[PDB]
Write a protein that binds this ligand. Structure first.
Ligand SMILES: O=C(O)CCC(=O)C(=O)O
Ligand code: NI
Length: 236
């Protein structure tokens, strides 16, 4: 593959014509790099502002695992058990609308201006938190809206496959998981999934301050390389 291109504060028009309309990924630089979250969100700050609130936590290496489960605990409990104290299992505070739950945190982020190029209402943009230790993995899957994934703490390795390559990604046949690949991107079973090997892709390491544009229906796979906090904006 090649690396996702990085662009510094492209104009709305450039973003619209070269990335949004054709559905091409890009990393936006110089857009979120000075949001307050970038300097402010330490573990300690997260504990102070959110520690006592209940959050959903995914436990297990990948959501496609058979032993994978979902539970509830306080943010303080999550940090203690799954981040700081030699964790026994992988825990991920994933896909959670933390900013609706805790409006004060919402002050530390913004809606990217590029979202106004969409046809949807700003109020209907879904903002999710993704907070977890090094080693969290989100299996290869596609989503039904455009996405800006903003990296705040730590880095993520991300692999992207175009919707045109769906055949080689062997989606699950169950209507429920049909937007998830059967393939483990970083250790694929080529005896069972031979078409996967030659499928072209883009990749990147997404670092703090950077925004990855994931076009609607683009397949994406994500592994945290460090203690990580990302904020996703699902928009149309
Ligand atoms: O960061 C991750 O682990 C996955 C994020 C994702 O799938 C999304 O923002 O739609
Ligand atoms: Ni996703």
């Amino acid at each position: 593959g090649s690396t996702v291109p990085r662009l510094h504060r492209p104009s709305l028009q450039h973003f619209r014509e070269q990335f949004l309309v054709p559905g091409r990924p890009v990393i936006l630089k110089g857009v979120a790099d000075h949001w307050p979250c970038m300097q402010k969100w330490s573990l300690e700050y997260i504990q102070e502002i959110a520690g006592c609130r209940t959050v959903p936590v995914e436990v297990g290496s990948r959501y496609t695992d058979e032993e994978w489960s979902q539970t509830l605990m306080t943010v303080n409990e999550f940090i203690s058990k799954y981040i700081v104290n030699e964790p026994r299992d992988v825990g991920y505070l994933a896909q959670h609308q933390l900013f609706d739950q805790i409006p004060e945190l919402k002050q530390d982020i913004s809606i990217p201006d590029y979202c106004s190029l969409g046809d949807g209402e700003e109020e209907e943009i879904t903002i999710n938190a993704w907070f977890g230790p090094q080693g969290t993995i989100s299996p290869l899957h596609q989503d039904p809206q455009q996405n800006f994934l903003v990296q705040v703490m730590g880095r993520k390795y991300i692999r992207l496959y175009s919707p045109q390559e769906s055949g080689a990604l062997y989606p699950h046949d169950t209507h429920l998981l049909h937007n998830t690949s059967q393939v483990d991107v970083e250790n694929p079973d080529l005896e069972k999934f031979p078409k996967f090997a030659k499928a072209p892709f883009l990749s990147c390491i997404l670092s703090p301050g950077e925004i990855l544009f994931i076009p609607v229906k683009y397949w994406h796979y994500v592994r945290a390389l460090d203690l990580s906090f990302s904020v996703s904006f699902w928009w149309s």
